[PDB]
Structures are given as C-alpha cells and as structure tokens.
Amino acid sequence: SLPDLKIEKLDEGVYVHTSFEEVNGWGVVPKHGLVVLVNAEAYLIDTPFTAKDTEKLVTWFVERGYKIKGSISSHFHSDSTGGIEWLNSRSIPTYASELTNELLKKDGKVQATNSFSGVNYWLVKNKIEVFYPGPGHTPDNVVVWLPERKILFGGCFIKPYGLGNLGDANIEAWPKSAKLLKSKYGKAKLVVPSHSEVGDASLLKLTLEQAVKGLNESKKP
Numbered sequence: 754s755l756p757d758l759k760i761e762k763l764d765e766g767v768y769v770h771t772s773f774e775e776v777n778g779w780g781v782v783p784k785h786g787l788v789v790l791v792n793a794e795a796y797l798i799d800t801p802f803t804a805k806d807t808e809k810l811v812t813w814f815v816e817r818g819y820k821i822k823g824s825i826s827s828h829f830h831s832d833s834t835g836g837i838e839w840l841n842s843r844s845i846p847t848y849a850s851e852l853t854n855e856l857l858k859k860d861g862k863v864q865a866t867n868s869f870s871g872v873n874y875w876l877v878k879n880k881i882e883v884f885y886p887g888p889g890h891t892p893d894n895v896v897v898w899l900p901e902r903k904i905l906f907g908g909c910f911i912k913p914y915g916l917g918n919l920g921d922a923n924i925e926a927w928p929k930s931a932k933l934l935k936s937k938y939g940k941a942k943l944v945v946p947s948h949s950e951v952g953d954a955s956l957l958k959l960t961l962e963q964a965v966k967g968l969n970e971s972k973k974p
C-alpha cells in the first residue's frame with residue numbers, strides 16, 4: 754500500500770536509495786538519497802522517510818559486507834532526517850550542520866549526534882564534502898559533493914521545474930544561493946535532486962531560474 758524502497762547503483766561506489774511518501778496535493782513523491790562506499794565503509798546521504806526503510810537500507814549494505822560509518826542529513830525536513838532516531842539507537846554516527854540540528858530541535862525532532870559549523874565540511878576527506886550554498890528550500894539546506902565521481906547530491910535545494918512548498922523557504926535568498934551553487938559546481942557530471950530524476954550540471958541553471966521566478970511570484974498580492 755506504498756511503493757517499496759529502491760536501491761540502484763548510480764556509479765562506482767555510489768547508490769541511489771528511493772523511498773516514497775504520499776504528499777497531499779503532490780501524489781506519491783519519490784525521495785532520493787545516496788549511499789556512498791569508501792573502501793568497505795558506507796555513508797548514508799540522507800535517510801529515508803521512515804525508521805523501517807532506514808533499517809532496510811542499512812541491512813542491504815551490511816548483508817553485503819559494508820560497515821555503516823555514518824549518515825549526513827541535507828536539511829531538517831523528515832525526507833532527509835526520518836531515520837536519525839533509529840540510526841542513533843544502533844550507535845551509527847549521525848551528522849547534520851549546527852543549523853540543521855537547531856531546526857530539528859525547533860521542530861520537536863531527534864537531533865544528529867554530530868554537528869559541524871561553517872560553509873565547507875569534509876565528512877570524509879577527499880571523498881564526501883558538504884557545502885552550504887545559503888538559504889533556499891530551507892534556511893539550513895546543504896549539498897553533498899563527491900569529488901572522485903563529480904556527483905552532486907542537491908537534496909531539496911535543487912528544484913529544476915518548480916520549487917515545492919515555500920513554507921520553510923527563504924525565497925528572498927534562494928536566487929543568490931543558487932547563483933553561488935551554480936558558480937561552484939559547473940563541473941558536476943551528475944546532479945541528484947531529492948524529488949526528480951538525475952540530471953547534469955544544467956539542473957543548477959534551471960534551479961536558479963526557478964528561484965528567480967519564485968521570488969517574483971512572492972511579490973504579487
């Protein structure tokens with residue numbers, strides 16, 4: 754009564770996990786995150802929505818011989834953070850920016866056990882980089898960059914065709930943030946949005962255009 758968790762190889766050492774929720778007005782919405790393999794260590798880039806799918810995901814990798822070293826959540830909404838509590842319960846390190854952890858707390862959610870400040874953060878040196886482009890979809894949204902394969906996980910900041918719900922957005926800042934992100938990751942081979950298909954670096958430009966339009970629409974009565 755709700756489509757099963759998918760796990761699909763995207764590139765060498767990189768898998769996309771897709772979990773599903775019904776969202777009022779939007780239908781059955783896929784949520785994409787990654788699993789990144791560094792030698793025999795696995796890192797979750799976003800959790801699924803639920804504890805149950807987070808556990809399915811972890812078990813798939815552990816069964817195949819990988820050690821779950823950590824998760825990083827790209828923003829505070831539950832499509833990035835739903836599994837943090839379960840991971841914490843299993844003593845799997847969970848990561849989020851300081852600002853994401855603040856907004857988890859404000860939202861009455863379980864926090865990541867580890868936090869980081871600043872604009873650039875290496876989760877794994879030379880392998881998994883976290884970048885804060887500025888506010889957009891949410892105040893805290895970050896992207897995750899995999900330098901070896903030139904893969905950008907955009908999370909819910911990358912919105913090539915429409916912005917989604919602006920309830921927690923900073924629409925005034927989003928164009929400036931999008932310009933920064935576009936300027937920094939023109940090199941991306943694959944850009945992975947949360948809620949639409951994988952594309953290339955062109956999704957950075959499309960997101961900027963959407964942000965610009967959305968800011969314009971915000972200024973109409």
Ligand SMILES: [Zn+2]
Pocket residue numbers: 828830832890891909
């Ligand atoms: Zn969100």
Ligand SMILES: [Zn+2]
Pocket residue numbers: 830832908909947948
């Ligand atoms: Zn989302």
